Amino acid sequence: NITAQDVLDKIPSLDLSFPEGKPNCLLGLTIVFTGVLPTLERGASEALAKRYGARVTKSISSKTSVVVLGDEAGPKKLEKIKQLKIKAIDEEGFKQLIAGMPAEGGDGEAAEKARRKLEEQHNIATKEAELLVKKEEERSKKLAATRVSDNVVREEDKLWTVKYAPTNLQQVCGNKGSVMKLKNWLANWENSKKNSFKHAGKDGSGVFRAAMLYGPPGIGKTTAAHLVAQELGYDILEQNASDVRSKTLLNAGVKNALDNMSVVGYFKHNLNGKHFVIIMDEVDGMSGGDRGGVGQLAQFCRKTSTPLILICNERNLPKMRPFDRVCLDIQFRRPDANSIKSRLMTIAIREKFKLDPNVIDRLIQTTRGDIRQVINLLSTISTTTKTINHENINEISKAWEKNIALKPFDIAHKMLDGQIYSDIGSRNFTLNDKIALYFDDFDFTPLMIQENYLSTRPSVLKPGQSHLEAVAEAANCISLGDIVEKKIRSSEQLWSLLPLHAVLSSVYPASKVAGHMAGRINFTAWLGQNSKSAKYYRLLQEIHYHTRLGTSTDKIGLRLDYLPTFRKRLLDPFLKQGADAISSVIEVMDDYYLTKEDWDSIMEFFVGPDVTTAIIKKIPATVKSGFTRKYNSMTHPVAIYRT
Amino acid sequence: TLSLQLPWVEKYRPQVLSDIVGNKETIDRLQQIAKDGNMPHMIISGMPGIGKTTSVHCLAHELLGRSYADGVLELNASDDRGIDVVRNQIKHFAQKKLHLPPGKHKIVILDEADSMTAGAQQALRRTMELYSNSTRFAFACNQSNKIIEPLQSRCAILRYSKLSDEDVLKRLLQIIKLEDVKYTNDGLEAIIFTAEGDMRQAINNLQSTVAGHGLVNADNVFKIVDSPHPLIVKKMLLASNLEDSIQILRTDLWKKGYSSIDIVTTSFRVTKNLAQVKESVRLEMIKEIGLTHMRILEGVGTYLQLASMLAKIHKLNN
DNA sequence: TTTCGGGGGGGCCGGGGGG
DNA sequence: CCCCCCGGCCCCCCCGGC
DNA sequence: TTAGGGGGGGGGA
DNA sequence: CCCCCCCCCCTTT
Ligand SMILES: Nc1ncnc2c1ncn2[C@@H]1O[C@H](COP(=O)(O)OP(=O)(O)OP(O)(O)=S)[C@@H](O)[C@H]1O
Ligand SMILES: Nc1ncnc2c1ncn2[C@@H]1O[C@H](COP(=O)(O)OP(=O)(O)OP(O)(O)=S)[C@@H](O)[C@H]1O
């Protein structure tokens, strides 16, 4: 009949309040939205596009059927649009497209493929519902037979998450690769034990005695662990945050279970039924540097004689450092909408409330990939509203929005975005919002801002103001913020000044240089430099108090004045006289109570053209060996006598 | 006199879901849940004095009836709620055997849950997961962000909105009719304006005004309820001439006994929430206010410093 | 990173009581 | 005379704005 | 408007 | 089948 291409040809083309179209009119069209629309906002335009079953990609590629070009379009977007030769339309263009493609079908193979995929999803949902009702009928028949000739819990009284929890591995949606990897690792654990965990297979999982599953909340980590443990015929010994897992309890608790037979396995007699699978769930839930037992669990991971699976939500936390390279790491990513659309449709039809498949993705966006949260949202909403569609999708999504604290990189990216500092953008993301964004991680926000405020192309420059001037203003404000921070952490503990520190350290300098990140966002380098400075100051103090009885100065004077002459009288002789100057160097060292470690540290202090790394390396190894032998073959004096 | 009159906030505390005003959709959802049961884990968040504890208690009562005493475990910030409590008392309550109708469950009400420690919240996770067949949890808090993400994932989110002046007026009229309180429209308007959507504050102010003066009119209401100083600070910051701002500072704030620290903190907050002013100007005003706040915290809390702050703000605005 | 102060949780030590 | 229960220090870890 | 770069996984000439 | 689309996730004490 009519193909979307001919409609687009009819629609006016662009070169470098809305009509109610028929259902799924934009089906099979990949609409990429860019710029600013006159009447519709980005969110409103995306919602309108989804209302008609149109894929809304966040980027532009060869599959971008159409493009919605508005005011203030991204330069990269225009560059890629011209490179890929993709048509663009205006607000009236989109209006005519929705009102000029009513057949909702009959277009090219893309529309037919989309319809076939939708029918396949519906059929899968119906088949799953049929299986569920068959299971319910079987359970009811067994219950009636038992009753005819203990109180059980009826399914109607159970939470939807429990009622629809996966029963086997296949029912787990998303993270198929991770699930398969875990299954393979656990299946061949006995073979790895036979090889003493020395040989590594194709996947390299044969050298780990423990596995660590990590991912965001409500994605199926515990479910997958339990399912894999049950499938391979193991006995599960599970621990969680509800149990005491301190170092003492760990030593007196599960430690004895590492190499112990299971009595239940013996009395329930698979060949692996007598062996334990120790599941430590919510591993990040234990607090304590040493008494918590995180380090103790890491040590256990290195000698466990039975499979050990750890589960945590935050793998990069400092508390998790002991688990660096001792367990096989398995990441569970946020599942995509498609992998769970069939499950959501099955739940919707079984619970006898209507759910529009075109809004499911939005619900996922509300929950940030939290399947448990999605099921809870459906259960709570369906109690009063039996139909879910575009009529009330916006309100439901806004009400249940998951306000997750941003990470330092995301905080830096958002705070340095120039849009939020414009007249229009400031009314949506207010100053209070920016202060809250700082308070998300007050400890790291000022450091990230100071690190990344010189690596942006600004878009908020005032007329006649250069990038350098704004940078200087931001630096001045950052210095004032540092003064305020010093005030906060003094003996007076003026924590009430924290909000002001938010403005001076992050919000104001960011507003001065807000724009587009000219390059990759970098983590703050100040902490590593501070640690290096502390180490070097400790070394300098050690050297100074070794030579105190001979010199007349403070440690700073020793670094600035004495060290060059000491270099001239310690390093130059080796380079000039070869190995014949070892005696003079040793004599100078003895005169000042210096040791070999002191010699190396002194050589490590110099900068600029006096760096000694290359010079030290170029020295023949024989000279260094002779120097070490001569130093070790004699007695030396001691400056500080420890007792 | 050794006798006390019961506060009207307690005497007229709603006992059923139908007596709660505001947040109509959430109240209807709670009513439906009470009718049908199968209450899920829930987190109720919102501003102070809007009827969160009232809603939770009413829902529990309608759900459990005669079994309320046995089937409800209530814990708040005044009770012990450490990790040991979660691991022993709450676990014992969850595992407790209690025969209930075919659509009811035991309820744990953790009021002011935002004050609970991270360890207790973490320990609650598997307790909620394992015993959901017989026990359900209802958290009530002011800031939902303090609740860890795993607990939020396990609960249904109910964000309470501020009460509109219409609902406050409706409840106040019911209370007045039940108490036979002589009033005037202007007095009720003043009470509503001073309440700022706080039903508890409005009821307390009404009761205090009736006790202290009898007739509820603007004069008596304002005598009992002082005009909020944030509005005075906003007027001071928005004054066109430095002389007017200094006049307001000296007459409405300094001579009334307001401390300099309170004045400067309120100025900071009001400037932060001043949408009518350009954001960059607000940032400059905040810089000046922070300088003054640091000076006051150091110990120089004088009227001269506040006057200098106002002068600098006006210079910036010019 | 961290200059007080508060809160919480876990580990021993030791007084008292019981057998 | 010896073992166990249970109160109190001692230490160590973690916020600190709204 | 997408900071750069790497990993996972559905679609397909 | 390699290539592409598309998204998510890591940089990080
Ligand atoms: N991939 C999934 N597929 C189907 N349902 C899921 C999935 N993930 C989570 N759920 C549902 O949410 C419920 C809880 O899943 P969990 O296995 O506990 O996720 P989780 O990652 O372990 O959450 P945390 O880490 O304890 S907060 C399941 O019983 C399911 O009903
Ligand atoms: N929606 C309401 N309808 C009627 N009275 C209310 C309402 N909200 C509050 N009140 C009255 O104010 C009193 C206290 O209400 P609460 O439920 O305790 O408010 P709250 O939000 O729980 O306070 P916080 O958050 O713990 S400070 C009630 O006993 C009622 O008398």
Ligand SMILES: [Mg+2]
């Ligand atoms: Mg879990």
Ligand SMILES: [Mg+2]
């Ligand atoms: Mg309350």
